Amino acid sequence: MRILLCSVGTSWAVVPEAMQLLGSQGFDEVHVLTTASSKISPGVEQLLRYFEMHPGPRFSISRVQDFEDLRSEQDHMLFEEVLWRWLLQRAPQAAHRYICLAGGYKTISAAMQRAAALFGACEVFHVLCEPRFGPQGNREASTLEEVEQAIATNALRFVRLGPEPGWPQLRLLSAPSFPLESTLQGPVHWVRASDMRLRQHVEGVLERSRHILAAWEGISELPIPALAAWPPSHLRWLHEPLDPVQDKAWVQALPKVELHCHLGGFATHGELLHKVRQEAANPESLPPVRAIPLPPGWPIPEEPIGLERYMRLGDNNGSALLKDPGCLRAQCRLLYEALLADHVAYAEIRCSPANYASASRSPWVVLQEIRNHFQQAMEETPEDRRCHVNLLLTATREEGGDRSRIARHLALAITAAEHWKNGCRVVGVDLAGFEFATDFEPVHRVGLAVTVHAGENDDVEGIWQAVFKLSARRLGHALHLSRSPDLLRVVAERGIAVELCPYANLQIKGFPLDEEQEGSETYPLRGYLAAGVAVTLNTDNLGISQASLTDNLLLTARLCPGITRLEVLKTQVFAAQAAFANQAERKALWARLAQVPVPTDTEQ
């Protein structure tokens, strides 16, 4: 098959001469696009007469009803749109598409050239005829007999500009998606276009392709591959220091990953605590509401308050309160709601089911209830906006106390690891202590991930033992890695992620805020980043800290001077890679991360 979409204006001889580019082969079918001007009529009848004889190829005529002359530019835009729609319809494939641009206005010829470039044409040529015809023999062929003489005397020089593949994005545009309104009027088609969606789509595709080509160079320094389609101004905005105030709305819309969150530290005070208490099944067993006063300046205390005070700041919720089934259900539902409000796409929650067990409720019952509450909340949400929740069991080390809880939690984790293989799963154990290796060989033999929770100590021996004795795949609150170059290098080489909680670290330990340049006491976030460590930003306790994931990502701008927004994107990518998810959850998380909010303040 070989088609030729020609253009006709005041001179109808272009089509008959263009009908001989191949020669004896000709074209199996040809079409013409022109205007509706009355002057184009006699040319149309002449073309019909020419088509009467030599009726080997297929014939049709299409004129635009809304564009005749060249007295407007909006008419030019409409002509371009109609030309593109007609090329899409009468030319499904550019491989079998031969385009002639001899006929039509100058703007018309440019339109054919541009359409060939955008949508591709197997071959574009320009038909020429010697003026050795007509009266005086000084005019080109303009009649049936003269046209035949030119075709019979080899009086047509054809200039072929070569194949033209076009754009990959503009070659898969089917005409049905861009219908053209036609009205049969005799042996010709009167085509009209309804909307200009085609031009806008083409312009957007071209701009996106230009952005992709401009960002191609540095495609290995972008944490998310989908960032290459951003305008260069946006990619420059992404390399500037994060603004804690103007960037609040951009951070709030980011799809975030939560890896360090405690179930029992969520609704520790305020209205959430009262809602949780109201949800209680039996309101009589509810313990009295203790009076826990927040330190002045909370959530930013004037001075650090250490870990014991921080933990005691959340005694109105947890072990004594979550033993009520209704309170536990309300806790889980409100935590999922809070995760949704922050646009978290993947979260790992830490729970202590043994702490919530009673006479009639074993740790297994509590764990199953928590898992099913989270799964039901997940299923009640659209998949496009659904946060995936997995569970980690916290095996804490009491101060010379109940060591049976550690065994119970480890056994519970080992059982729940095989119990559930879909939806909400139990993916690891959090070892808040030892900062014991014999207790955890069974954990490693069943494929459970281990995360070690450092606390109330600044020793590197604990980190060394967690990395090489407990085989931890993540470290929590490892704020003293720089104090041992060997340990820092090992952590970077082995890909062990470090969980940092800005507000929790600031309130428990305290760091300089809003300084000018990195001193010897600054937050180690950027020092870790420059060392190759996979750093993730978390919340620790939503309630005790009063800070969300957005709040922590924003406070990183005051704890770390000059931290850029590409750095927060890198932290999110690090969290996505460090999650204990499986292939399906990892694919879903990566699909969610590929949707970064577009900046709004890229004007300085």
* Residue 121, C-beta contacts closer than 8 angstroms, at least 6 positions apart: 94, 97, 98, 99, 163, 164, 166
Q: Dihedral sign, CA of 500, 501, 504, 510? A: positive
Residue 410 contact among ligand ATP, other proteins, a second copy, none, beta carbon within 5 to 8 Å by kind: other proteins
Query: C-alpha angle with apex 353: 293 to 477, nearest 5 degrees?
Result: 60
Among 183, 233, 319, 415, binds ligand ATP (CB under 6 A): 319
Helix (H) or strand (E) holding 182: strand 180-185
Q: Is 204 exposed, middle or buried (0-12, 13-18, 19+ CB in 10 A)?
A: exposed
CB of 234 vs a second copy, minimal distance in Å: 15
Among 341, 407, 513, 584, binds other proteins (CB under 8 A): 407
Only segment of 67-75, 148-156, 231-239, 263-271 that touches ligand ATP (CB under 6 A) = 263-271
Among 17, 342, 430, 540, binds Zn ion (CB under 5 A): 540
Helix (H) or strand (E) holding 205: helix 197-215
**Residues 228-257: x/- map of binding to ligand ATP (CB under 6 A)?**
------------------------------
Position of minimal CB gap to ligand ATP: 264
Site for ligand ATP in 497-516 (CB under 6 A): 504
Annotation-wise, does 189 bind a ligand?
no
Does the protein bind Zn ion through residue 164 (CB under 5 A)?
no
Q: Is 390 exposed, middle or buried (0-12, 13-18, 19+ CB in 10 A)?
A: buried
Annotation-wise, does 548 bind a ligand?
no
Tokens of 282: 């039996």
Among 31, 211, 262, 409, binds ligand ATP (CB under 6 A): 262
Crossing angle between the packed helical segments 565-578 and 583-593, to the nearest 10 degrees = 170
Does the protein bind ligand ATP through residue 358 (CB under 6 A)?
no
Among 101, 112, 141, 263, binds ligand ATP (CB under 6 A): 263
Which three-class secondary structure state does DSSP give residue 124? strand
If the CB atoms of residues 224 and 429 are measured against Zn ion, the closer one turns out to be: 429
Q: Which residues pair with 129 in a beta bridge?
A: 156
CB of 167 vs a second copy, minimal distance in Å: 7
Only segment of 71-79, 100-108, 127-135, 409-417 that touches other proteins (CB under 8 A) = 409-417
Crossing angle between the packed helical segments 549-559 and 565-578, to the nearest 10 degrees = 130
Tokens of 297: 């300046």
Q: Which residues pair with 6 in a beta bridge?
A: 32
If the CB atoms of residues 60 and 396 are measured against other proteins, the closer one turns out to be: 396
Residue 437 contact among ligand ATP, a second copy, Zn ion, none, beta carbon within 5 to 8 Å by kind: none
Which residues contribute to the site for a second copy (CB under 8 A)?
Answer: 165, 167-169, 209-210, 212-214, 216, 219-220, 225, 228
- How far apart CA 371 and CA 375 sit, in angstroms, is 6
* Residue 598, C-beta contacts closer than 8 angstroms, at least 6 positions apart: 230, 234
Residue 446's identity, in one-letter code, is V
- Phi/psi of residue 500, nearest 5 degrees: -115, 135
Among 208, 480, 489, 509, binds other proteins (CB under 8 A): 489
- Chain contacts with other proteins (rule: CB under 8 A): 259-260, 357, 362-365, 403-404, 406-408, 410-412, 414-415, 418-419, 438-439, 441-446, 464, 468, 471, 486, 489-490, 493-494
- Chain contacts with ligand ATP (rule: CB under 6 A): 262-265, 318-319, 350-352, 355, 394, 396, 432, 453, 455, 504, 540-541
